[PDB]
Design an enzyme around this catalytic site. Structure first.
Site, PDB file in Angstrom:
ATOM      1  N   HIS A   1       0.815  -1.193   0.000  1.00  0.00           N
ATOM      2  CA  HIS A   1       0.000   0.000   0.000  1.00  0.00           C
ATOM      3  C   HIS A   1       0.848   1.241   0.000  1.00  0.00           C
ATOM      4  CE1 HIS A   1      -2.778  -2.664   2.723  1.00  0.00           C
ATOM      5  NE2 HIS A   1      -2.583  -3.179   1.524  1.00  0.00           N
TER       6      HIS A   1
ATOM      7  N   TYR B   1       3.897   2.585  13.954  1.00  0.00           N
ATOM      8  CA  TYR B   1       4.399   3.628  13.035  1.00  0.00           C
ATOM      9  C   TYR B   1       3.811   4.993  13.241  1.00  0.00           C
ATOM     10  CZ  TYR B   1       0.370   2.494   9.970  1.00  0.00           C
ATOM     11  OH  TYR B   1      -0.880   2.278   9.450  1.00  0.00           O
TER      12      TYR B   1
HETATM   13  C1  LIG Z   1      -4.717   2.774   8.635  1.00  0.00           C
HETATM   14  C2  LIG Z   1      -5.900   2.912   9.548  1.00  0.00           C
HETATM   15  C3  LIG Z   1      -6.845   1.915   9.650  1.00  0.00           C
HETATM   16  N1  LIG Z   1      -7.909   2.073  10.443  1.00  0.00           N
HETATM   17  C4  LIG Z   1      -8.832   0.951  10.563  1.00  0.00           C
HETATM   18  C5  LIG Z   1      -9.578   0.552   9.305  1.00  0.00           C
HETATM   19  C6  LIG Z   1      -9.695  -0.951   9.494  1.00  0.00           C
HETATM   20  O1  LIG Z   1     -10.830  -1.228  10.307  1.00  0.00           O
HETATM   21  C7  LIG Z   1      -8.482  -1.378  10.293  1.00  0.00           C
HETATM   22  C8  LIG Z   1      -7.412  -2.025   9.429  1.00  0.00           C
HETATM   23  O2  LIG Z   1      -7.359  -1.374   8.165  1.00  0.00           O
HETATM   24  P1  LIG Z   1      -6.630  -2.138   6.964  1.00  0.00           P
HETATM   25  O3  LIG Z   1      -6.309  -1.066   5.806  1.00  0.00           O
HETATM   26  O4  LIG Z   1      -7.449  -3.480   6.624  1.00  0.00           O
HETATM   27  O5  LIG Z   1      -5.305  -2.614   7.720  1.00  0.00           O
HETATM   28  P2  LIG Z   1      -3.910  -2.942   7.010  1.00  0.00           P
HETATM   29  O6  LIG Z   1      -4.152  -3.875   5.720  1.00  0.00           O
HETATM   30  O7  LIG Z   1      -2.954  -3.414   8.217  1.00  0.00           O
HETATM   31  O8  LIG Z   1      -3.391  -1.507   6.504  1.00  0.00           O
HETATM   32  C9  LIG Z   1      -3.081  -0.480   7.449  1.00  0.00           C
HETATM   33  O9  LIG Z   1      -2.243  -0.978   8.503  1.00  0.00           O
HETATM   34  C10 LIG Z   1      -0.956  -1.439   8.083  1.00  0.00           C
HETATM   35  C11 LIG Z   1      -0.179  -1.933   9.292  1.00  0.00           C
HETATM   36  O10 LIG Z   1      -0.737  -3.156   9.748  1.00  0.00           O
HETATM   37  C12 LIG Z   1      -0.185  -0.344   7.381  1.00  0.00           C
HETATM   38  O11 LIG Z   1       1.046  -0.909   6.919  1.00  0.00           O
HETATM   39  C13 LIG Z   1      -1.005   0.234   6.224  1.00  0.00           C
HETATM   40  O12 LIG Z   1      -0.324   1.359   5.662  1.00  0.00           O
HETATM   41  C14 LIG Z   1      -2.399   0.649   6.688  1.00  0.00           C
HETATM   42  O13 LIG Z   1      -3.202   1.011   5.551  1.00  0.00           O
HETATM   43  O14 LIG Z   1      -7.991  -0.177  10.892  1.00  0.00           O
HETATM   44  C15 LIG Z   1      -8.040   3.200  11.190  1.00  0.00           C
HETATM   45  O15 LIG Z   1      -9.071   3.433  12.013  1.00  0.00           O
HETATM   46  N2  LIG Z   1      -7.139   4.162  11.085  1.00  0.00           N
HETATM   47  C16 LIG Z   1      -6.104   4.045  10.309  1.00  0.00           C
HETATM   48  O16 LIG Z   1      -5.275   5.036  10.306  1.00  0.00           O
END
Ligand SMILES: Cc1cn([C@H]2C[C@H](O)[C@@H](COP(=O)(O)OP(=O)(O)O[C@H]3O[C@H](CO)[C@@H](O)[C@H](O)[C@H]3O)O2)c(=O)[nH]c1=O
Ligand SMILES: Cc1cn([C@H]2C[C@H](O)[C@@H](COP(=O)(O)OP(=O)(O)O[C@H]3O[C@H](CO)[C@@H](O)[C@H](O)[C@H]3O)O2)c(=O)[nH]c1=O
Lengths: 194, 195
Positions: free
Chosen positions: B74, B138
């Site tokens: 990403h 991070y």
């Molecule tokens: C990035 C971020 C995510 N979220 C919420 C949305 C989702 O319910 C949950 C996880 O989002 P996902 O995009 O499926 O998680 P993931 O695939 O781990 O991706 C995020 O988390 C990763 C770390 O695990 C980062 O490396 C990525 O840049 C980031 O986009 O967290 C937040 O509330 N705030 C955030 O800043």
């Protein structure tokens, strides 16, 4: 009662300026995710904007095993504390600031779904309850070992302190923490000392 | 198997402009360890960019992941400073998605608590968990919102055109979003100009 909490703050009445936060932790297949700190969301809940105003920032991380006890440390900067892994600690605080609240205490269990803002002048400590824990915190000034003689500390094992550790008798502590002064020998911190 | 007592140092990654790898001093004792994971005053002089703090925005995210989880790739519309907060270990993977001479360039390295990485906006980021579990912490310099997702770029972790190797694909645990990200050929390179 770990996942899916609403972001919210509660004042800690015993200790002026201290705030306890509920942090939303989102779980899935892989594990979990949180916004540990989000300045825009946290200012309106009472997080002080004065925190970032000198433009200084440092993030420290400790990793500790069961029964480790670290404290009690009241350095001249603010702290935002939380747990970064699946672990748990008993967080303990003693206010070392000059005035009516000198010696006031608070204790609470901290896991990744809770954080604490600790104002400068309030001594911070914890003991580990889980097998191991990752403790991560943000600060707004910079520590130096040669300067350590100027920061305030109080001995974890002073029985006059209004705290109860999980396991005092078996605590794993540093040599420094064994030798901090008892409360009766601590000069209360004025704003001039921070 | 070098973990403790590294001198604080930074190295650019030549293939991905703006990227920096830091060696973080980790101090061990009878209780476990301590590090200054991020320290502005000490890290600015080593190359940590002053621009990271210019808007006064800060968010710190933490993910906890189990062995064989693979997350990525990403590229987000903000800069990132990544590290490990516990005893765990990941294989970190990056693909430059920025328009220019370095589009599709890659880098990989093992990250534990004694290494961190600065990832510029527009560089796709991912990892695979090598230890039983890992805490990945991070720092970012803009605020996440659901409505910002259309600004990201994504590239498929399995795209064979990527010059990268993962550790265990047979056993990799990948999200449905991550399984279905486009291949590099179908990614529109991110212009700095507007993005
Ligand atoms: C990035 C971020 C995510 N979220 C919420 C949305 C989702 O319910 C949950 C996880 O989002 P996902 O995009 O499926 O998680 P993931 O695939 O781990 O991706 C995020 O988390 C990763 C770390 O695990 C980062 O490396 C990525 O840049 C980031 O986009 O967290 C937040 O509330 N705030 C955030 O800043
Ligand atoms: C506070 C601090 C410590 N150090 C180094 C000195 C030591 O070799 C090692 C551990 O330092 P100690 O002062 O024993 O750390 P510890 O008892 O965990 O106390 C610190 O860390 C605690 C969290 O572990 C905080 O709750 C305290 O405010 C803080 O003083 O880290 C740093 O390099 N930078 C620091 O900012």
């Amino acid at each position: 009662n770990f996942f899916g909490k609403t972001l919210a703050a509660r004042p800690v009445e015993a200790i002026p300026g201290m705030l306890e936060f509920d942090i939303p932790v989102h779980g899935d297949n892989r594990g979990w995710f949180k916004e540990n700190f989000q300045k825009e969301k946290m200012l309106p809940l009472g997080f002080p904007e004065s925190f970032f105003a000198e433009g200084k920032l440092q993030n420290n991380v400790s990793f500790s095993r069961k029964n480790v006890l670290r404290g009690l440390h009241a350095e001249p900067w603010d702290k935002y504390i939380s747990v970064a892994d699946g672990g748990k600690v008993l967080g303990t605080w003693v206010d070392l600031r000059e005035g009516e609240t000198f010696g006031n205490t608070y204790q609470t269990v901290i896991d990744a779904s809770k954080s604490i803002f600790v104002p400068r002048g309030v001594a911070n400590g914890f003991q580990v309850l889980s097998d191991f824990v990752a403790y991560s915190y943000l600060v707004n000034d910079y520590w130096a070992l040669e300067l350590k003689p100027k920061y305030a500390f109080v001995n974890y094992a002073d029985p006059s302190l209004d705290i109860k550790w999980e396991n005092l008798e078996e605590a794993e502590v540093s040599e420094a923490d064994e030798n901090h002064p008892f409360l009766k020998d601590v000069k209360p911190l004025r704003k001039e000392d921070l």
